[PDB]
Amino acid sequence: VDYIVEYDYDAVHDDELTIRVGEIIRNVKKLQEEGWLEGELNGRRGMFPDNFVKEIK
Amino acid sequence: PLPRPRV
Secondary structure (H helix, E strand, O other): OOEEEOOOEOOOOOOEOOEOOOOEEEEEEEOOOOOEEEEEEOOEEEEEEHHHEEEOO | OOOOOOO
């Protein structure tokens, strides 16, 4: 599944993604850490908060 | 830990 960024988010650790409104995050997986997702943006994989994004359907 | 950042 892919997700679309709806709200800007800045990474606070090196394993999170810095993401921007309109960007598509690819190959997105739900994680054990509740409220967090993992996917790929501009070649890099990291985690980002799920309420900044919306699942493309 | 990781919070759940707020919109």
